[PDB]
Design a protein around this ligand. Sequence first.
Ligand SMILES: Nc1ncnc2c1ncn2[C@@H]1O[C@H](COP(=O)(O)OP(=O)(O)OP(O)(O)=S)[C@@H](O)[C@H]1O
Ligand SMILES: Nc1ncnc2c1ncn2[C@@H]1O[C@H](COP(=O)(O)OP(=O)(O)O)[C@@H](O)[C@H]1O
Ligand SMILES: Nc1ncnc2c1ncn2[C@@H]1O[C@H](COP(=O)(O)OP(=O)(O)O)[C@@H](O)[C@H]1O
Lengths: 684, 675
Amino acid sequence: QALKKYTIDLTERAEQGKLDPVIGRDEEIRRTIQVLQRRTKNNPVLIGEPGVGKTAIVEGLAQRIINGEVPEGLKGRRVLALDMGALVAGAKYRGEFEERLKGVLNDLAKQEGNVILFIDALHTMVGAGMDAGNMLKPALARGELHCVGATTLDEYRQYIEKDAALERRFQKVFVAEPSVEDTIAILRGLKERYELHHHVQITDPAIVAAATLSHRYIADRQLPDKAIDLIDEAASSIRMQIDSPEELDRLDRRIIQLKLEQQALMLDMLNEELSDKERQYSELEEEWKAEKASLSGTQTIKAELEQAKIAIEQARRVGDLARMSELQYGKIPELEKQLEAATQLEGKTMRLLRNKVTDAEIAEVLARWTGIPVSRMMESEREKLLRMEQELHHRVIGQNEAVDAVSNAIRRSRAGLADPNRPIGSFLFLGPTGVGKTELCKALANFMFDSDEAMVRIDMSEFMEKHSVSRLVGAPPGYVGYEEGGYLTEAVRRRPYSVILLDAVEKAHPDVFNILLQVLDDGRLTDGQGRTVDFRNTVVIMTSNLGSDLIQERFGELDYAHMKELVLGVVSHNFRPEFINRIDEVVVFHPLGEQHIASIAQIQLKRLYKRLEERGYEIHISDEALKLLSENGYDPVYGARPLKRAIQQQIENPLAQQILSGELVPGKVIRLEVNEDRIVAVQH
Amino acid sequence: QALKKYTIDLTERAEQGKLDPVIGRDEEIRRTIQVLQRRTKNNPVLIGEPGVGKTAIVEGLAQRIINGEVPEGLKGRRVLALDMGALVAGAKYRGEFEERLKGVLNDLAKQEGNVILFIDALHTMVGAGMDAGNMLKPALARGELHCVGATTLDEYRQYIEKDAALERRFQKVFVAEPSVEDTIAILRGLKERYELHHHVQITDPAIVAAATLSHRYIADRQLPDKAIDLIDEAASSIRMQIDSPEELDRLDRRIIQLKLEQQALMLDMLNEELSDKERQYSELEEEWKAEKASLSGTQTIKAELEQAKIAIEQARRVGDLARMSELQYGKIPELEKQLEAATQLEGKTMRLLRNKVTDAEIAEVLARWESEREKLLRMEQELHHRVIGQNEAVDAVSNAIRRSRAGLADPNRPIGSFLFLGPTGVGKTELCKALANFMFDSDEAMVRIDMSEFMEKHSVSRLVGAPPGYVGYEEGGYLTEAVRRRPYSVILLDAVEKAHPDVFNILLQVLDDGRLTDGQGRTVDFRNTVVIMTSNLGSDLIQERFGELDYAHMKELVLGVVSHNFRPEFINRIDEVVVFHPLGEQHIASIAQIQLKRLYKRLEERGYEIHISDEALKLLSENGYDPVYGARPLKRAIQQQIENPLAQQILSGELVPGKVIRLEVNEDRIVAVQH
Ligand SMILES: Nc1ncnc2c1ncn2[C@@H]1O[C@H](COP(=O)(O)OP(=O)(O)OP(O)(O)=S)[C@@H](O)[C@H]1O
Ligand SMILES: Nc1ncnc2c1ncn2[C@@H]1O[C@H](COP(=O)(O)OP(=O)(O)O)[C@@H](O)[C@H]1O
Ligand SMILES: Nc1ncnc2c1ncn2[C@@H]1O[C@H](COP(=O)(O)OP(=O)(O)O)[C@@H](O)[C@H]1O
């Protein structure tokens, strides 16, 4: 024969129950049977992005052939899974490939249409060394084969819409991703399957949270394959933690260590201590065996329940009379209620932990994938949001108003009250140059997701040309950066949960504001390569200096409201009404006071003492030296980077020179005493 | 059956202890035990760079199966290692290979989901002749097979990620290269193995030095394989030096030579000399046999100690009562103390020697294949070797190396920042190449980029990285992209006086943190390099008044001149400003002598012998040296004024070989004569 040599008889497998009873998908099975009951062009192809269960649609079609939900044009049909890889890979020679394939077509035509041929990965058939299309073509035209394809949409439009004859030989059935609730229903059927295998239980809140958080976060793989990945991987982690016991291992190491100690000593007391620890070890071991026996009985009774369900389906196919009522009314409710009695018994007895996969397990598995704070406000990030003013003032002294505004913005977003097409929050930082624009940016990226490195800083001062705009969106096809990628859009597509930091957007060309109009309108910024860039998870922050002299000269005896309205008017003179129209909340910075400069110096002393204690020195400072640093590092035009370069040039250059001179000794208290113009270090 | 015909039971070998004690890798065995117990994707493939013991990760999984340290469902599995190579070519028929593999797969269907299959180099399962992929692509989805793959990343990315009916029956259990201390941990168990085969002793400082030098120097292979091969080859080296001596060879050649002479003379005295040397040879031979007997007894009783350890482990597994305490209290301490007595006895008697493995043996195995002070002294000495002159600059760079390579400076700043001030062509290129030839051990382990061409606005668009679709684009980038090509080198920016303020902004970004991104979004670090610049105005002040002035106030005056020309804060972040003198007579003489050395090497390999006169060297010194260029006019003047009349005369059929070819002078020429 040929058919047993190359194909996989799926109806025999579904008759042996080795498949998945996939719930739903009723319209796609209907449209596949609409195609398969035609006269010519009997060839549906199942098209969708991978993971959506096109193989499962074919297997569910086979299960409906076996049970008999099909019309009277498919009953008794066999479904055979041709393996396109299993015909190419023997052909060394001229015409041994076509030998096999003509053998397959003669045996299927001997069956006389009684065999629905199934071909998975149909885009292997076309380019496989003329080969396989130009023999199947006279059979696919006359309907004497019954091919069912299964392919990704990209391989469809690449390997078939090219070759138009084999395009019209087939027929599309567009398969869409399932919904969230359909994903939940699918996973409920698959829970009822999977708890036979991993010997555990699954609580349906973990199922719905798994589906929702997988749809929220995993943006490469698609439903339901990613949800099944999460559920199965958590089931395997719990199958580990059945036999992971740690306390028995600690007690065994303790008793063998005290055994070696007592055997070396042969005052004693250790016969008594070892007897107590052996008694505790035996009790924990017997409790462990009791838990194992409980889980074994629960698994066996769950397996007998599922075999009873399979047997009552056997009675639904065959048609025994008393067997139906007997199996149902006896076997289903009593086995379910003592399955729940075993469930509450395991809830009583599992001290040595879980057999029920909770949502925290899903959080641990998805955190091992990516690392998001996946779950909700867990009173650690939530109290962080309740002290988000304090959390931002942990690193950024001063500028209370913008801290409050950004805190309110993220408090709106994490509660789900943002308009979910816009990005998380637009910001127009104003005011004096170099106070903590970038420090608030770093602190925001820090206490948003990870750290200061989950950002993209873009100097907008460099973009002053038309081809600069074509750079930062991406060059259109047939041109240059279309080879070598866009600028902004690639930086977003690498870091999808990030912060975009612009720098002096007023120094940019007067048209990049229109790209920002698209950004702050809807957060899709279609690049040069024609694929969308999704800003709905990010935070766009823009910095400027359009009223730095205006704010520094009028901060005295003017409140926050008049300052905001005045700088709104001035920015309206500079910018356009559309651009400031799309902004969520323009904040206004104020100039710095000398106590804030002293606080910046304090934080620099904190980080410098940390670095030099990692180096190995114990250094103290007089506050007079702090006052000299504060007076030598502020100006109305530059701000606190004068303090930074003053700290660098007056500490980091001379004191490290004194260290490298073999002068200073690690461990000594090093008081940074003052000079007339400098700071001297002593060894005391 | 066919399992006996084509598989390798790992569990029987670990059952009889033939395999290796797997050390570490708890996490990867954990991830393997996860992926082995799922319902889908039930086939891991251990993926990493090759030779990191992926086979032994499977073997340690098998050992934990035998020792019961696995979860409950794995308790009772069988690990079988199917060879891709064992199956191939018993076939003249049209697929006898396929028949045998079908018989194996039916046997694994008969074993009913128990046998866990091992295959390494899973790409060979994909293409080897249906051959092994699509005979098993059913069995890799029908639950009758639990294969454990093992391959490199490249074969996974090609031959498995593509094949979409195979792509989701496999997970990437990533196995990384173990660290130095991890490799130490792996070696500390197999040291027990690697003495019982080679009859020697291994010491732990040699092990950590071997791991350190292996990770530092051998870069073809990786850890832990290369450290293990160093240990095993050192064991072979000591096995050779014990089993095979030198003075015995000298004495044997001497006695057979004097035996030849005495047999010839048949005055004598040689009967007496030969008898003395034969007595000495017999004494050394008997001492050598005594040493060999001592080492034989030592290693036999060491193997007895190890078999006592194996026997007390057998008594731990079985549970005999008197055997445990008997084997412990008898067999361990007396055999250990007389093994140490044999060790100190060999320390007394081995003269004719070595039985241990030391770090000197590690150096020997590395050569037949320690950092800061030695590298400091070798750096300074090679500075005095290659580049002539500029000993002040030698000391300046040596001071900067002593300041930066102590580690007590900022690791967020670039290492070497300088300004070469002096006339051109004096050896600035030579100094850069000597820096490169020590610090990265090649002359072109560096980057030379001139800055004199970048006076216009097209400097950041030509040095850093161009906008898309303009002049400086299709070479990549001058400065930034060379570091992406060579992250391990030294950077030069000659003629920085012709710069542009964007370049000064770039260099302040360099001297701040070293990170710098081009116009298309690639973050490039500079801190692992050395950046050097040049100017030629205070150099003209040097050419004016280097004589009768010092070096330090010279440095202060030229730093003031640079402060006139450059920004003070721009040159403030520079580590050290150096001064280059005009080399005048003796260094010109030396570099001309170097050019004469390479000329003499080529003319000696022709077969001549040429001696220069010092007067002709003075003519070359006066004709080639100039105050504006240095010595590249001296190079072409050497080329012309020597080689062209010389090659004129040699091809004249004139200068006979084998004579002193004296470079005398004419009134204006440099002529060679024959006498
Ligand atoms: N409705 C469903 N009910 C139950 N399981 C499903 C359902 N749809 C998909 N699955 C499961 O999803 C997994 C694979 O889904 P598929 O859609 O078959 O992925 P796929 O068909 O292999 O797609 P590609 O392109 O071949 S990767 C199997 O474990 C199926 O059981
Ligand atoms: N409120 C603050 N708290 C702590 N440190 C700050 C604060 N404001 C500024 N700094 C320091 O001041 C400097 C300002 O630099 P930057 O923010 O880059 O310039 P600009 O203020 O023009 O945006 C930063 O380098 C930062 O170290
Ligand atoms: N746990 C371990 N401890 C020490 N050495 C190991 C360990 N595991 C493997 N090795 C070494 O790795 C070598 C095998 O390399 P392997 O990883 O099997 O090959 P490949 O390069 O094909 O992945 C063996 O010589 C073994 O000594």
